[PDB]
Amino acid sequence: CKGEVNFKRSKFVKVPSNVAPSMLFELLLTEWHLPAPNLVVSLVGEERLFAMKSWLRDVLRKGLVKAAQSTGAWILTSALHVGLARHVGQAVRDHSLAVRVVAIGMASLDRILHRQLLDGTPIHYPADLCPLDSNLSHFILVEPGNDGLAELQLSLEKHISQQRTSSIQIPVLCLLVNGDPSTLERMSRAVEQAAPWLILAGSGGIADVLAALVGQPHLLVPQVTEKQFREKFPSECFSWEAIVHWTELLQNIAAHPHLLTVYDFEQLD
Amino acid sequence: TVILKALVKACKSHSRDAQDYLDELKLAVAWDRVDIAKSEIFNGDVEWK
To answer: Which is the most buried residue in A8, A114, A146, A257, by most CB within 10 A?
Structure first.
C-alpha cells in the first residue's frame, strides 16, 4: 500500500502487522533506492512531557551529527513526531540542508490526524491526532494492536540483524529516552531478540530508575518497584498486581545484563 | 555565592514558576555570578519563555 504525499514529496507504505519483514525491507530499499546502511539506531522514547536536557540534548545531537556525517547510518524514530522527537527531527532536517542518513518515522494509523483523509494526490496537513513535519522525508505507516506494532518493529530489527545476504551484518541499536511504562515491556520483546540496548542516566525517570533496578538484582522487590515508580513520575497510581507483573519483566530483562549497559552522559561513538 | 544559593533554593522549593525565579535572577545579574546562578536556574526543570 504505497502512498506519496505532496507537501517535498514524502513516500510511505501502509503495512499491517505480521507482514513479511524481508519483503518489507526489500520493497522499501527497491522503492526509495536508499544506499545500504552501515548502522541502524532506533528511538524508543516519546514522552513529550519529558523535555530534553538542554546541554545534554545539544551534546547528544552534536555527537549524532558528527558520527552520521562520516560513516552513514539509519534512524528509527516515530512518524508524525510532535513531542520531544519532533524538534530534534526538525533540527536534523535543518542540518541536512547545510554518505547520508535518512530519518524514518513509524507509527500506528489510529493516533494519526487526518487518518481518514489519508486513507482517501496532494496531501496537505498544515497543523501548527498527530500532524506530520518535513522531518519525515520518507515515512512508515502501519494500520493493523500496540503489541502488534512492537513485534512489527522487533521483526524489522531482527531481519536487519540478518545473515550474509563476504557476510554483511548491519548492527542495530536501541535508544531508550524517558519512555512510557509500556516501553519496559517493549524492551522485554527486544531482550529475547538479542538487541544491544542503550539507556541514559539523566534522560528521564524511566531510564534513570532502570539504571538502578537491573543493576541491583532482586528476585522479589515489589515494594521497591512501587517506591521507585512513585519517585519517578508518580502521575497515576498503579495496582500492586501490575507492579508485580512489571517486576517480573524486570527480573527477565536483568537476566540478560550483557546486551545492555548504561552510561552517564551528564557526568559517544 | 552561598547566599544566592540558599535564596534560589528557597525560591525553587516553594514553587516552580517563572516570575519569582526571574526576580532572583535579576539579583544574580546584579552580582554577575552568571556561572553558578545560571547553572542552578537553567539546568533545572523550570521553563523560560
So the answer is: A114
Q: Which residues of A touch B45 (CB under 8 A)?
A: 51
The rounded distance, in Å, linking the Cα atoms of B35 and B4 is 12
CB A173 within 8 A of CB A42: yes
B42 and A54 in contact by Cβ < 8 A? Answer: yes
What resolution in angstrom units was achieved for this structure? Answer: 4.3
Gaps in chain A following residue numbers (C to N > 2.5 A): 7, 98, 120, 128, 144, 165, 267
Give the closest residue to A57 by CA, choosing from A92, A94, A82, A105.
Answer: A92
Method: cryo-EM
Selected residue of B41, B43, B47 to mutate for chain A interface (largest A Cβ count, 10 A) = B43
Those of residues 39-98 in A touching chain B at CB distance below 8 A are 51, 53-55
Q: Which residues of B touch A265 (CB under 8 A)?
A: none
**Cβ distance of A55 and B43 shorter than 8 Å:** yes
Q: What's the grid cell of residue A174?
A: 536501541
Helix, strand or coil, per DSSP, at residue A97 = helix
Tell me the one-letter amino acid at B46.
V
